[PDB]
Amino acid sequence: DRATWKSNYFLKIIQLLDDYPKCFIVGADNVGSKQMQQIRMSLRGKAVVLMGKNTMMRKAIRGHLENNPALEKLLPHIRGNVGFVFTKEDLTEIRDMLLANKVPAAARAGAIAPCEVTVPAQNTGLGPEKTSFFQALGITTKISRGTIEILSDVQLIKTGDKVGASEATLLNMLNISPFSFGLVIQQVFDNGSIYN
Amino acid sequence: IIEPSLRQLAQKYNCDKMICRKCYARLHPRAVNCRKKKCGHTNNLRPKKKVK
Amino acid sequence: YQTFQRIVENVNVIISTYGEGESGPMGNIMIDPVLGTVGFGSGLHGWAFTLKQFAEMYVAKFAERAKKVEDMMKKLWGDRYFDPANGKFSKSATSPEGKKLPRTFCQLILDPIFKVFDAIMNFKKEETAKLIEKLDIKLDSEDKDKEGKPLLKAVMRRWLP
Amino acid sequence: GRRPARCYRYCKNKPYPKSRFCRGVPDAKIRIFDLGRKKAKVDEFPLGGHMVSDEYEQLSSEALEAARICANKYMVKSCGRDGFHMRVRLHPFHVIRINKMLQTGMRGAFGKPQGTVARVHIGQVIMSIRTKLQNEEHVIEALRRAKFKFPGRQKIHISKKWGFTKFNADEFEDMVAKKCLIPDGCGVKYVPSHGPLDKWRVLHS
Amino acid sequence: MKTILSNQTVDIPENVDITLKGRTVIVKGPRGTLRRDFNHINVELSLLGKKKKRLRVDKWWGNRKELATVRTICSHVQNMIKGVTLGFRYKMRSVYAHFPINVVIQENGSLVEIRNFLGEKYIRRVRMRPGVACSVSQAQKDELILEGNDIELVSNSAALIQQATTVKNKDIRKFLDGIYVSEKGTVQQA
Amino acid sequence: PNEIKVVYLRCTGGEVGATSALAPKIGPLGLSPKKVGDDIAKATGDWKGLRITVKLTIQNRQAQIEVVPSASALIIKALKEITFDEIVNIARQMRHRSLARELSGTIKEILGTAQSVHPHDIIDDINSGAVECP
RNA sequence: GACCCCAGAAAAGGUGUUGGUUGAUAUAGACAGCAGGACGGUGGCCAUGGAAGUCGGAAUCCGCUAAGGAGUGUGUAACA
Ligand SMILES: [Mg+2]
Ligand SMILES: [Mg+2]
Ligand SMILES: [Mg+2]
């Protein structure tokens, strides 16, 4: 079944290149499958996004080099966790809607935190039994209005360091907006052209 | 009152290990064969039991 | 101080979940070290202290007195910081210089206790003598001779009975 | 209550079947010899695997019962109650004897029937399992597990025949198509090209 | 099967000089000098170039057992290069439930005293291997630092401390007290 | 904030249940409904799913308003008492209607597959009314 | 370990090494590592005090897809 699956990918990539003249090469970050489902539903009207093996893409493009020249410019650019998206609408609108639909990704434990988050002093709204997590982080808290109330602002995690499980689950209970990211455009291909 | 970070470190040397079913030898958690000649380097291993 | 904070929080969340609300007939029931409803010390050596006792002697260091000690118990306990060099309190965890500040609870309640605990238990004769004179703790015959843990017991017995 | 099988492991005596001379034989331990879907048609189960013996020795009826249950339990666990058909191809027809020592000594030493064993020759088939073609690893594992209930050395074979028949599997299909074979229950009937023509007329019609 | 030739090469940095006396490798760098003789293994050690400074380990007609001793030497030399440039630093965290473990670093870091391990009056005096210095961190409450040029010496000294604090007659899954190697690193982080 | 955070769900159905379900224990979330609130909750919940009836509520601070999401097994067993291709087709309009689809034909394929609890051959050779749904 | 009778060993094992048989994957990028994702109907049906992928009986489908089993194990009373 692997042989037929690869061939189906080849006819899939080859007919999408023939159909669309304009594409964005885009690098997928640490984005969940739900994020990709949201993107595909967002773009379902106008654009179609395809991702797969980079070595598979390079082979299919090299086979199509003779029939469609000037596609060799994409050959020294399929590097890293990147994929295609096929568009016919204007570049600035496609880019703008792409940079706008970013999901609020939650804090996953053990990962790098590129966004520096700080927790202000406000009533969490959580009952006086989730205080185990607050005491785990040493955050001094008092119970006011029959619910957890943080006394003062606490800095939780800085940029460029690993997050822990206790920090992650505290963010999950607090439901605050942690570091979030989506697919970001590496380059753009407009009928044989390379830009940023 | 050990913090969770230090509980992980001490368990790396005390609890997260494989045990031979033939000679009870304490092996690393990725072992597939016992290292000891008296059991014939058998592959009958079981995880070391936890306290949970 | 963190351990004292954990006990206070654990007690408070117990009475908050199971007991009535703040608007119940009893009213506010939570314990506060700033309120003087929770004390410290050890019963085996016969010495205990409250936030009230320290604020009494620090207002003395500084109706009317009742108000003074009551408002001072707020700055005695909590996440408030005190620079030894400046001599003034602060609500900022970092000084303008950049010096890390100690919290007021450890800086002027636990600090004398740690000084006397270290002094007696490490047999520093001149340090113990100067501390007793400065803190005006009075000792008597058959007690001035002893040294070691019994001397430690007698000192806090007569300092914070 | 029974001697170790090491005392009766080798075919040292002439065959001693239960007959009008050997009387008083207790019933053999194994009474059932086919399990699974015995009623399955021939074309349902094309794969046949055997447990062949390597030693000319005696297998006790108690070992045959233990090994038949052992293979049955694993085949049920992996192929379902209706996914396989097993057939123990040894019957315990030889009677072993015991000389009971509590006239003392070797005087009147001829023994009484103790049990039954089956004498197996080198290359003889002890157990056969037929099943679907995809269950090959389960057949090999079931026969391998049943090997531990037997004394000697046994080999696991995957026969080139179709199921339990005596015809090679690569020729079974077109032999049935050309009417040389007609199924009858779990086996097939070979129809030769000689006989009354009325039987040739019953076929092809 | 005797493989005709199994060879492996290690690249030496510019600021390091490796000198060979037969199968004795002398590695000299900014942090000092390391010496280690591989006379227990029959290999051909040679120095290849001038600007690249390669060290090649050859093994002719070796079977499986002594073909495994080619990468072993190459990794030992790479550890020697690592030691004389960056040095080896093993951080150890002391973990305890009730009784804090008191560690006193004696003369030159050569001696380590563990006083209150599981609250017992016995004093464990562990001596470091020569060339290894132990220290108490100012960045963590309960943390030792074992620094030295030789990975073999430093990690052996760390194992001496760790096996010194071994619980007996109890359930080690429950009583986790002791000193354990937390992270294995270097100095100068370059 | 809708004056309350009451978007919490419920998994009761069939009989009234009231206190015998988890309603009294989950009642202190809003603390207003209690016996009257969860009784009038089941009042409109008796029908529109006699199964587990995974539902959601919005509190009017004294009463409740219930919304019943179209669970596949719920609507299939409630519509049951065969193919009934007409009734499944007309029911794939008012549901949650997303199902990560691209065509409304895919939704009826997925629930025609979920109703297998064989009715898979219809999906196997599906060639009629594919774009009739949208 | 070391020579007919003959003077001591079996089943069963071994990621010790040596040879051999058969099969499978691979520059359309094997394997092993490190690094992301592992979704939606759906907490699928019947089971019950709770069984949400993972106590069990059966089913074993679908869209989205690069891929994701109505689930290989760990874990929770169930969740997580
Ligand atoms: Mg005889
Ligand atoms: Mg290594
Ligand atoms: Mg004991």
Ligand SMILES: [Zn+2]
């Ligand atoms: Zn072993």
